[PDB]
Design a protein around this ligand. Sequence first.
Ligand SMILES: [Ag+]
Length: 80
Amino acid sequence: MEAQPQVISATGVVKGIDLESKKITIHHDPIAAVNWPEMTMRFTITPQTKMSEIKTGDKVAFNFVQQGNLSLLQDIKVSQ
Ligand SMILES: [Ag+]
């Protein structure tokens, strides 16, 4: 609804992943929607994040929302 954050799409390379602590670090390409340059950033897996098999070193396509100080993944998959 109205106050909820918008869904941001991006692409990048997985630098590391820890399913136990719900952490994925992604070196992503620029994101115009939030005025971010190419960056490495901490993303957060939630129980709702729609995942496929992801491993360190994979190129990925993903969507997230910014909710306070966390970047919450909505979905992630390997990409070309
Ligand atoms: Ag970022």
